[PDB]
Amino acid sequence: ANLRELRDRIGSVKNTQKITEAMKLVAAAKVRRAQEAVVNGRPFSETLVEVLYNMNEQLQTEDVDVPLTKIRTVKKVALMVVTGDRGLCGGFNNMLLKKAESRIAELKKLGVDYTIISIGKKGNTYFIRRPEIPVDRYFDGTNLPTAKEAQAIADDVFSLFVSEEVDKVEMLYTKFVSLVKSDPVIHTLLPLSPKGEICDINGKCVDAAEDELFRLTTKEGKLTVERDMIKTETPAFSPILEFEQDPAQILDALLPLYLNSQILRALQESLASELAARMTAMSNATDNANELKKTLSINYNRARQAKITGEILEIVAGANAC
Amino acid sequence: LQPRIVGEEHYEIAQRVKETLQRYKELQDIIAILGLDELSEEDRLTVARARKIERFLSQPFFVAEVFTGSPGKYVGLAETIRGFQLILSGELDSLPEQAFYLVGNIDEATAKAMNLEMESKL
Amino acid sequence: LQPRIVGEEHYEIAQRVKETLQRYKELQDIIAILGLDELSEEDRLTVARARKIERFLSQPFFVAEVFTGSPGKYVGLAETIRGFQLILSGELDSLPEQAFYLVGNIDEATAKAMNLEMES
Amino acid sequence: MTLNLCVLTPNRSIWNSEVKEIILSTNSGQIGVLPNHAPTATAVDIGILRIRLNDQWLTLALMGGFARIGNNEITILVNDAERGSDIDPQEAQQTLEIAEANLRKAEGKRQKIEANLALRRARTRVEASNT
């Protein structure tokens, strides 16, 4: 009973190829839904940045003193890492936690008293298995990331910074720039410029090349993504707004919205890049299962012909001896 | 199907038809996910030309006429390659896909296209 | 291959080499369909050390100097034992695998890794 | 017959329909807006945005944000605005009791602000789900 073994093995490889191409296609559909969420949530932040830019151009000579936008250089650090939810991940969570190790390596070496706010399920599993690194809060993706996860993370980061305990709350995540390569970035979150741009860990305003609103178009016959520069932004005009509230309180109520906007967009971008990595991993798995199905069918046909040959040669040998 | 045997023209047009149909076969899943609009322009013209080619590979038969009714056509190789040159370079792209289906001899495809457009004008 | 015949150090190093190669051969099908990205940390360290081992097991021959060039190396016994002790010990985990391919006497693998990272 | 109103959470536009009379709970208190209001760009506290459809008076449940009044095209950028009344008050009071409970245990300096904001959001949730 070896031929039924090879037949069932070939059947298992066929089924595994089928389910890997199914995972590939449904991951592509969820990439499409993630880009839908991103380009639908964009114009809120568009109007937010135009309002905030006008407000801060009217509020430079003032004293504004909002706790989110102050610069308390006594140098604590709160690096927040967001990782993938489920597995097969391409190479997402490994390189994320690797850059996390590199960042806490340069951090602890400077004695800046870092800490970690882990968001993803794979990342927080990694951190509960390695307690040698300190960690603040735990989050997950069974809860929907579009509203409630981002709201909870914004609540916790706001409660960490406004209660002025730690400085330099930055977020390590993975902007979806390519379907094969997804290099993580470290952008600061709360020690923000009052002008209201996303900055680097150096502060050098990476909104210059942020490349918003990625889209998916094939090039020749394989799937690729297109990222352009500027879309449907109207930030220029600054009409009279007639502030009824005290101007310091206006920014004091505006900046949490920017916190939520940045956290939500980073969650959505890391989700889309995780789904792209899973799409690529499942394409490779389908192709390897296809080549293995071919090899196993070859070996099966060989063994079947050898079995038939041996059987008839044995029967004929017995009949000739008789 | 080798240049030395069938002419470089016939070989190159047959290889281009094979490439077009293969690209469409690879792109059916993406068109099922994204759609024809979220593709690119070269891919979109490829998909349209491929649908037209796949319907042009049909033929009404002299012996299948007895239940289908269409008079049945004989298409030599010269009209085949002259029709596929026109359907592959952008000379006949403003036509319906149901105009090339179940015809021979690409002039009949243009004639049935004009009739299918008269169906709209009327 | 018995500790009373080849000593205990040779026997233990051959045992550990065969153990890591057996673990590699075990997980080969899983890393064939899926890939290296889904293993644990210790399993991927085992994979990397097994690839280093199976590269270091090759050698240039004196009689195959017509097939490759780069003339054959006679590698003694103690040099082989020390080279595999260094691979399995964790020292030589930060150098390319191609430094181990077609060399002998792991000092030459170190020299080839230096040459690779210098010529770039 | 009124100004254009768009309530916009971060992820989506909740609803962009126009209604008559809006009471906007700011950081300075409640303020009513009129159709053809002169432009006032204010803030919004964690509170209650009540509307009036000129047929019935309705409340909207929001967790903060910012507002802008323009030339009858007003935009209110909110934090968490759930349309109309999607909840009933029993689970609201089940959240109130646990928010006041965890206020005691959450006693560290950051937990003060955190529990206080959770309380101000639970209170606006229940006083929005009263109707």
Tokens representing D47 are 């509170």
Pairing of strands D4-8, D73-78: parallel
Distance from CA of A265 to the nearest CA of C (A): 27
Q: Name every residue in B having a CB less than 8 A away from some CB of A.
A: 23, 26-27, 29-30, 33-34, 38-40, 42-43
Instruction: Judge whether C16 and C88 are in contact, CB under 8 Å.
Output: yes
User: What is the interface size between A and D, counted as CB pairs within 8 Å?
Assistant: 101
On chain A, the residues whose CB falls within 8 A of the CB of B23 are: 220-221
Q: How far apart are CA C89 and CA A277, in angstroms?
A: 34
Collect all residues of chain A within an 8 Å Cβ-Cβ radius of residue B29: 25
Contact A88 C34 (CB under 8 A): yes
Does an interface of 3+ CB pairs under 8 Å exist between C and B?
no
Q: Which residues of A touch C38 (CB under 8 A)?
A: 87-88
Collapsed DSSP state (helix, strand, coil) of residue B50: helix
Pick from A266, A289, A286, A290: nearest CA to A278: A286
CA distances from C63 to C55, C66, C68, C72 (A): 20, 7, 10, 8
> A156-172: string of b/e by CB count within 10 Å (b at 16+)?
bbbbbbbbeebbbbbbb
Question: Nearest by CB to D41, which of A40, A163, A241?
Answer: A241
Chains that touch B (3 or more CB pairs under 8 A): A
Resolution (A): 3.3
State residue D44 phi and psi, 5-degree precision.
-135, 130
Breaks in chain C (C to N > 2.5 A) come right after none
DSSP state letters, D8-19: E-SSSEEE----
**A40, A252, A260 ranked by CB distance to D79: nearest:** A260
> Pick from D112, D51, B88: which is nearest to A165 by CA?
D112
Q: Would you say A92 and A84 are in contact if contact means Cβ atoms under 8 Å apart?
A: yes
CB contact under 8 A, A45 and D8: no
User: Which of D33, D39, D43 is CA-nearest to residue A245?
Assistant: D43
**D13 vs A251: CA distance, rounded Å:** 22
* CA end-to-end distance (rounded Å), chain A: 28
List Cα–Cα distances, A245 to A52, A66, D94, in angstroms: 15, 14, 34
- For D106, nearest residue in chain A (alpha carbons): A159
Would you call C11 exposed, middle or buried from its count of C-beta atoms within 10 A (0-12, 13-18, 19+)? middle
Angle A79-A109-C89 (CA atoms, 0-180°, nearest 5)?
105
Provide the 3-class DSSP secondary structure of residue A177. coil
Distance CA B82, CA A196 (A): 63
DSSP 8-state assignment for residue D82: B
Q: CB pairs under 8 A, 24+ apart, for C33-40?
A: C33/A16, C33/A285, C33/A288, C33/A289, C33/A292, C34/A88, C34/A281, C34/A285, C35/A281, C35/A284, C35/A285, C35/A288, C37/A88, C37/A89, C37/A90, C37/A91, C37/A94, C37/A281, C38/A87, C38/A88
Judge: A215–B38 Cβ closer than 8 Å, yes or no.
Answer: yes
Interface test with chain A among C31, C34, C37, C41, by most A beta carbons within 10 Å: C37
Domain ranges of chain D: 1-87, 88-131
The strand pairing partners of C65, in sequence order, are none
A89 is annotated as an active-site residue: yes
Q: With an 8 Å Cβ cutoff, are A28 and B38 in contact?
A: no
β partners of residue D61: D48, D82
Give DSSP secondary structure letters for A24-62: HHHHHHHHHHHHHHHHHHHHHHHHHHHHHHHHHHHSSSS
Structure letter (DSSP) for residue A147: I
Q: Which helix (H) or strand (E) holds B54?
A: helix B41-56
Q: Looking at the partner chain, which of A87, A91, A292 has a beta carbon nearest the beta carbon of C32?
A: A292
Closest residue in chain C to residue A95, using alpha carbons only:
C37
Count structural domains, chain C: 1
The token duo for D74 is 């007003």
Contact (CB, 8 A) for A55 and A236? no
* Angstroms from D114 CA to nearest CA on chain A: 6
Size of chain D, expressed as the number of residues it contains: 131
Instruction: Tell me which chain C residue has its CA closest to the CA of residue A13.
Output: C33
Q: D47: part of which helix (H) or strand (E)? A: none
Structure token pair of residue A19: 């389910």
CA D38 to chain A, closest CA, distance in angstroms equals 9
Contact (Cβ atoms closer than 8 angstroms) between residue C68 and residue C102: yes
Query: CA of C99: how far to CAs of B46, C17, C50, C60, D9, in Å?
Result: 48, 19, 14, 13, 57
Could you tell me whether strands D13-15 and D4-8 are parallel, antiparallel, or unpaired per DSSP bridges?
Answer: antiparallel
What is the distance between the alpha carbons of residues B81 and B1, in angstroms, rounded to a whole number? 13
From CA D129, how far away is CA D113, in angstroms rounded?
Answer: 24
Domain, as residue range, for C116:
1-120
Distance in angstroms (rounded) separating the CA atoms of residues D83 and B77: 68
Instruction: Give strand ranges (E) for A162-264.
Output: 169-173, 185-188, 215-218, 223-226
* Touching subunits for chain D (3+ Cβ pairs under 8 A): A
Let me know: does D91 contact D125? Beta carbons within 8 Å.
Answer: no
Handedness of CA B39, B44, B50, B51 (dihedral sign): positive
As given in the structure block, the two tokens for residue A154 are 């914004």
Residues of A in contact with C33 (CB under 8 A): 16, 285, 288-289, 292
CB-CB: which of C32, C33, C37 is closest to A90?
Answer: C37
User: Which whole-number Å values give the CA distances from B65 to A172, B68, B71, B99, B113, in the listed order?
Assistant: 69, 5, 6, 19, 21
Partner chains of C (3+ C-beta pairs under 8 Å):
A
Q: Which of A89, A199, A205, A322 is catalytic?
A: A89
Burial environment of residue A302 by CB neighbours within 10 A (0 to 12, 13 to 18, 19 or more):
exposed
Q: How far is C67 from chain A (nearest CA, A)?
A: 30
C-beta atoms of A28 and B39 within 8 A: no
**Hey, how many other C-beta atoms are within 10 angstroms of the C-beta on D122?**
19
Question: Helix/strand/coil (H, E, C) string of chain C?
Answer: CCHHHHHHHHHHHHHHHHHHHHHHHHHCCHHHHCCHHHCCHHHHHHHHHHHHHHHHCCCCCCCCCCCCCCCCCCCCHHHHHHHHHHHHHCCCCCCCHHHCCCCCCCHHHHHHHHHHHHHC
In residues, how long is chain B? 122
